[PDB]
Amino acid sequence: GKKEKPEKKVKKSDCGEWQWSVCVPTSGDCGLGTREGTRTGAECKQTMKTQRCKIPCNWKKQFGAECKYQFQAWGECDLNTALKTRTGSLKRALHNAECQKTVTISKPCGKLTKPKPQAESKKKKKEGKKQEKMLD
Structure with missing residues (x-):
């Protein structure tokens, strides 16, 4: 700001x-x-x-552990399209820990506008029992 x-x-x-x-x-x-x-x-x-x-x-952001995987970068996050892509490849496969040989993934590098300060909004979002109405 x-x-x-x-x-x-x-x-x-x-x-x-x-x-x-x-x-x-x-x-x-x-x-x-x-x-x-x-x-x-x-x-x-x-x-x-x-x-x-x-x-x-x-399946989390862990493409390896005892196995071996390398992430490569043909390019850095593209802001023009607001997109980011990364390639990965298996470096070694174990006898009880096998891996895919290659991965390609593309994830939107940008984001939509998500305001941090939320307005009062609808206070009736959830049904509640207001005791004694409002005291009167």
Whole structure:
């Protein structure tokens, strides 16, 4: 940013601090799990935020271990197309650790615009039981 100097405003006489719940990995052929944390404002208001965790999926970024694999680069990430490609090749195959002989992979080097500061959004995203209406 060109603005700089962030850090939101804070008020003394807080109500409670961020309480974090345990992330639900979800599970389901590699599904995105989420964690929910909530806090009360200084004037005691229900504040909440949800985070997305990581799910251990089969076949990770480990194209080798006891086996031998080399990644080569015919070119560096292409910003013009916002794409990146890399080639790999088997250097040695073991008796109980075999590898593919070559791999070619292309992954978008760029990304779509993903805002960091989320708006208030729909507070009715999840159905909740608001006690005594609003106190009246």
